[PDB]
Design a protein around this nucleic acid. Structure first.
Ligand SMILES: [Mg+2]
Ligand SMILES: [Mg+2]
Ligand SMILES: [Mg+2]
Ligand SMILES: [Mg+2]
Ligand SMILES: [Mg+2]
Ligand SMILES: [Mg+2]
Ligand SMILES: [Mg+2]
Ligand SMILES: [Mg+2]
Ligand SMILES: [Mg+2]
Ligand SMILES: [Mg+2]
Ligand SMILES: [Mg+2]
Ligand SMILES: [Mg+2]
Ligand SMILES: [Mg+2]
Ligand SMILES: [Mg+2]
Ligand SMILES: [Mg+2]
Ligand SMILES: [Mg+2]
Ligand SMILES: [Mg+2]
Ligand SMILES: [Mg+2]
Ligand SMILES: [Mg+2]
Ligand SMILES: [Mg+2]
Ligand SMILES: [Mg+2]
Ligand SMILES: [Mg+2]
Ligand SMILES: [Mg+2]
Ligand SMILES: [Mg+2]
Ligand SMILES: [Mg+2]
Ligand SMILES: [Mg+2]
Ligand SMILES: [Mg+2]
Ligand SMILES: [Mg+2]
Ligand SMILES: [Mg+2]
Ligand SMILES: [Mg+2]
Ligand SMILES: [Mg+2]
Ligand SMILES: [Mg+2]
Ligand SMILES: [Mg+2]
Lengths: 122, 46, 227, 394
RNA sequence: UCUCCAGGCAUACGCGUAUAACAACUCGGAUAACCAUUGUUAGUUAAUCAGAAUAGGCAAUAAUCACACUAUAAAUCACCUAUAACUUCUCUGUUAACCCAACACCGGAAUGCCUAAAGGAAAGAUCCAAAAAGAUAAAAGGAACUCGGCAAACAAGAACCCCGCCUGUUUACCAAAAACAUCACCUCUAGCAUUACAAGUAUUAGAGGCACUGCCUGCCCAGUGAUCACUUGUUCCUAGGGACUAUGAACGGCUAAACGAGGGUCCAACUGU
RNA sequence: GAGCUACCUAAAAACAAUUUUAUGAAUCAACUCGUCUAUGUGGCAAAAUAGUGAGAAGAUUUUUAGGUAGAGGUGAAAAGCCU
């Protein structure tokens, strides 16, 4: 006589049954049955200053949309890294060991924001 | 006495007797799940 | 899913909570009939190696003081808390033990017979022939396994070389090494057999369920006709 | 010898190692690279894992022998829950004290004086008993864990009202849940007491000495009784990791340096969890003696000697109906030997404040056999209680 | 407003929007009104109600107003020693006339408080037939009824036979009993430990039978001369020669009472049988 | 498949009043059961209703979770019970 198709949520079942609705934890339950909220675990909204900002929600219908060109690794590399290496190659002051000079990161460990595995939310 | 009321609902009993974890505990139960997947059942277990 | 309650590794005088079986096994099927319910009971860990010298002590005869003679739910006989040194341990109590009495536990094998005082533990070699004993142990250092029920006494029939013949309460004669330890006297509750249950309900208190309601020589061919 | 713990309940023995490991020079192929178990590959052997930093939530303690305060010599600790098998006789031996029945004559004479008698004394005590047992709560029958603290606290407040007659009583104050501790030696045994008091009453002046120097010297003839085969340390905690400490309940500089009375409460609801009168007295003596000895060491240092100025401390213990009164005089700090000047303790035991209380009238065939109140109230017990409180003031 | 009825309010488990308003009047309620129905919009708000660091040492002393007592079936972390940490409120439950019975089912359904201050309506309208069901009353009589005093009664008292000792248990849905169990008694099996029996040990445990109690009967235990001699008996060596003997079964008649929705019987009363 | 039922394990709960030699005692509710009769017989009900009855501090009743599965389990044996 039970309903098999509806979702299992905390509203159903006995009182002992409990489960979350998808909210991220903001603290720890210590011994003695005490909740201890952690300030670092609570997301902080980084909101910029919008004074003097010229961009608004919509755009002029007369504004031309551009040709779609999704960014690629090569496109990023040419814009940022290529000029430095090309200039250094002409001067001859280039070596394999010092790729970090141009912006290469040997490892993501020690960075606050790691690209892989990602350690920051959107 | 009057019959027909043999179902005495209890969610703890229902999930323990027929739930996901119960079915995967034995190979016979896993095969139960495989059969229901092959048929296309929307509900594989309680 | 059945886990035995006998999971305590360290000896203590604190009573231990017992789980009942009902006659089932770890499989969950009845293996013995007539077992169910009863009064809730607590287990008091008995020490059946009377001569257990205390930790960090020499193996020489020592004495212990009888604190109290209690009633045991788990046994026909009654138990006595006995104290010596800094150690307390439950033991089986003999016929005449009282609180405040002193009992000896001796390793010494007397070359001559040792006077028999009820409650003291001596090697069977020390005892003289004919002395009633209880809590006998088949093998030296094993621990008492026989004659530990209420009122049961075993006679020491004979001693030859390093072996003695012990007549068990069933009159079955047994032999053991004279190094084995026995306790003098008969076990307590000498009148346990005189008890009258009186009513059916009293047995159900003791964890006993009622019996079921259900209610072969083959002749040889020469005798088959004449059966 | 029977071994405790059936094998089925023990931790299962490790499964045997894969035979590929036995072969020398061969590197087994395991499921380590997969990062999950598979039944058909060899089981990896992992080196012990170190987090690389300390996580308080998952701290792991070092073994006993690695603790800094680990010491070869055992120290037997007496604490609240210890129940001495031999009762007072064991407590007398441990503390090297002589027992005299009855309270000191000076204390007894205080309440014989009519002036000390409180106005409406009997009625107020009866009201305290009724309030402690019945009126204080909304429930039909209060439990001992509530009224046992309440009865004593009410009595102290009743006795504390005598400041009208005696302004000196303003020089003493009370604290609650105070820790007391001492370490001393008895005949090659290192003994420590760790304890607390339900209430501690302390004064700004020392209590008068009860026994004269001649009486203290006369105790040398008295010999501490022995209880073979039971050892003095039975029911004590054998501790190998311990720190030697002395505690009087307060830090140095406390304006009330002299403790006056210690109160101990058997407030447990269940009988098996409640100390018996004999064992309560032993606990009172050891806890009171510890309080006295800690004070002695603070004043006179760590030396062992017979004290020129003895220390007097009082102890009261009750389960809410029975009261035990104890007076201790500390005469010596030379306790290592069992012979010489001995301490003196005066005890009045098993004093019934009231025999029984009926929270609800007893009715038999519509006849009120017993009224709803205290039964067989004994005012004598409170007079002893009042006498000890007034001691050292009047 | 009136007449009458007398299980209500909470929690648990369960149920899953049936909650509330509006709008509809197709379907659903076994009919209307009105909605429990359809559509749309809303709703249940908690730091107290409810759910969701480590290693050592260690315990004889029920509950019942716990005192006195008596009892037997023997009956609920703490505290201490060290180590580590050195200020916190997020998450989830909360509606209802509701659940299990295919139904808006005279059914089943735990606990706390209370017994009307809470909660409800037996009659859609009319008529006053037969038969059928239920309630009340009965002249004279009082079991003449009937298989049977079934049912009913202004009665609800007495007594005896049979069976079972008794309180219990059983064929859910045609048998509640004389059957089963039962204390007591008897027979058989077992001399022993780390998962049942049992952390037990012959006064124990298991298997099974059977009313107990007291009272009877008496299978039986070589003979003859007396602890003693010969004949037997059993073995061998060959009919001879040695070697060796060393209370109680089966049953019964009934403690003899008490008790019973057991099966028969009788008297008194009572009655529309 | 043991959310019914049979038995068991763990943790819990309920039992007013009245008498008694003090209890598997007595009277009688709540509660559990189901003696006898009538109704009902596609019923309110795939076993009920209405009366009348039995036990009602115990071998009592009841709640929650767990256990034993068909060549089997459970059974105070009715070859009864296991949706
Ligand atoms: Mg069905
Ligand atoms: Mg149920
Ligand atoms: Mg039978
Ligand atoms: Mg409307
Ligand atoms: Mg309609
Ligand atoms: Mg509505
Ligand atoms: Mg609607
Ligand atoms: Mg609500
Ligand atoms: Mg139906
Ligand atoms: Mg109303
Ligand atoms: Mg009508
Ligand atoms: Mg009539
Ligand atoms: Mg008539
Ligand atoms: Mg006739
Ligand atoms: Mg006729
Ligand atoms: Mg009739
Ligand atoms: Mg019967
Ligand atoms: Mg009966
Ligand atoms: Mg039945
Ligand atoms: Mg039937
Ligand atoms: Mg019947
Ligand atoms: Mg029937
Ligand atoms: Mg029978
Ligand atoms: Mg009957
Ligand atoms: Mg007649
Ligand atoms: Mg079940
Ligand atoms: Mg009652
Ligand atoms: Mg009865
Ligand atoms: Mg009755
Ligand atoms: Mg009756
Ligand atoms: Mg049954
Ligand atoms: Mg049969
Ligand atoms: Mg048959």
């Amino acid at each position: 006589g039970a309903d098999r198709m509806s979702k299992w949520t905390s509203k159903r079942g006995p009182r002992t049954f409990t489960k979350s609705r998808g909210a991220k934890k903001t603290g720890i339950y210590t011994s003695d049955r005490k909740f201890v909220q952690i300030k670092e675990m609570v997301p902080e909204f980084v909101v910029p200053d919008l004074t003097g900002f010229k961009l608004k929600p919509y755009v002029n219908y007369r504004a031309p949309a551009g040709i779609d060109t999704p960014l690629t690794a090569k496109a990023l590399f040419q814009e940022t890294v290529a000029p430095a290496i090309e200039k250094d190659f002409k001067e001859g002051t280039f070596d394999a060991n010092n790729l970090e000079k141009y912006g290469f990161e040997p490892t993501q460990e020690g960075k606050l924001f790691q690209l892989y595995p990602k350690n920051f939310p959107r | 006495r009057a019959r027909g009321n043999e179902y005495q609902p209890s969610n703890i009993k229902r999930k323990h007797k027929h739930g996901w974890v119960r079915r995967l505990s034995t190979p016979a139960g896993v095969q139960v799940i495989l059969r229901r997947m092959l048929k296309g059942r929307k509900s594989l277990s309680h | 899913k059945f886990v035995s309650w006998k999971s305590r590794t360290k000896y203590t005088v604190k009573p231990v909570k017992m789980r009942k079986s009902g006659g089932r096994d770890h499989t969950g099927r009845i293996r013995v009939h007539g077992i169910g319910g009863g009064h809730k009971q607590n287990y008091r860990m008995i020490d059946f190696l009377r001569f257990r010298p205390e930790k960090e002590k020499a193996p020489e005869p020592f004495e212990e003081k009888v604190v109290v003679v209690r009633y045991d739910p788990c046994r026909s006989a009654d138990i006595a808390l006995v104290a010596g040194g800094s150690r307390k341990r439950w033991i089986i109590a003999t016929e005449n033990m009282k609180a405040g009495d002193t009992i000896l536990n001796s390793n010494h094998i007397g070359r001559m017979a040792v006077a028999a005082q009820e409650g003291d533990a001596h090697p069977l070699g020390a005892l003289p022939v004919g002395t009633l004993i209880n809590n006998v142990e088949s093998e030296p250092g094993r621990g008492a396994q026989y004659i530990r029920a209420a009122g049961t006494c075993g006679v020491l029939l004979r001693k030859v070389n390093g072996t003695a013949i012990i007549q068990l309460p069933s009159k079955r004669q047994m032999q053991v090494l004279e190094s084995c330890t026995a306790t003098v006297g008969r076990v307590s509750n000498v009148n346990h057999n005189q008890r009258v249950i009186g009513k059916a309900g009293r047995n159900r208190w003791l964890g006993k369920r009622p019996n079921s309601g259900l209610w072969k020589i083959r002749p040889l061919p020469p005798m088959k006709s004449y059966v | 010898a029977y071994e405790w713990g059936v094998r089925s309940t023990r931790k299962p023995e490790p499964r045997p190692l894969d035979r590929v490991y036995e072969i020398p020079g061969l590197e087994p192929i395991t499921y380590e690279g997969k990062k999950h178990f598979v039944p058909w590959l060899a089981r990896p052997i992992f080196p012990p894992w170190e987090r690389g930093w300390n996580d308080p939530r998952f701290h792991r303690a070092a073994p006993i022998h690695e603790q800094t305060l680990y010491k070869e010599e055992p120290c037997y600790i007496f604490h609240q829950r210890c129940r001495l098998l031999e009762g007072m006789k064991q407590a007398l031996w441990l503390t090297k004290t002589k027992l005299i029945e009855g309270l000191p004559k000076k204390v007894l004479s205080l309440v014989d004086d009519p002036a000390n008698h409180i106005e409406n004394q009997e009625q107020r005590v009866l009201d305290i008993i009724s309030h402690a047992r019945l009126w204080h709560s909304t429930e039909d029958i209060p439990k001992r864990e509530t009224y046992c603290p309440l009865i004593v606290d009410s009595l102290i407040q009743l006795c504390k009202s005598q400041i009208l007659k005696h302004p000196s009583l303003a020089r003493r104050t009370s604290a609650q849940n105070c820790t007391l501790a001492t370490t001393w030696n008895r005949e090659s045994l290192l003994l420590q007491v760790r304890g607390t008091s339900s209430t501690i009453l302390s004064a700004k002046d020392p209590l008068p000495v009860i026994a004269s120097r001649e009486e203290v010297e006369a105790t040398r003839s008295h010999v501490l009784e022995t209880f073979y085969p039971i050892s003095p340390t039975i029911d004590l905690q054998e501790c190998h990791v311990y720190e030697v400490k002395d505690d009087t309940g307060f830090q140095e500089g406390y304006p009330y340096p002299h403790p006056h009375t210690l109160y101990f409460l058997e407030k447990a609801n269940l009988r098996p969890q409640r100390f018996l009168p004999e064992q309560l007295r032993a606990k009172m003596l050891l806890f009171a003696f510890a309080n006295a000895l800690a004070q002695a060491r603070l004043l006179y240092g760590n030396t062992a000697k017979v004290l020129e100025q003895p220390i007097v401390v009082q102890s009261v213990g009750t389960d809410g109906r029975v009261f035990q009164f104890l007076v201790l005089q500390l005469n010596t700090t030379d306790l290592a030997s069992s012979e010489g000047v001995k301490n003196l303790v005066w005890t009045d035991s098993d004093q019934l404040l009231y025999r029984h209380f009926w929270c609800r009238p007893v009715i038999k065939k519509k006849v009120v056999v017993e009224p709803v109140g205290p039964v067989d109230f004994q005012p004598e017990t409170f007079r002893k209680f009042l006498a000890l409180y007034l001691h050292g003031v009047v």
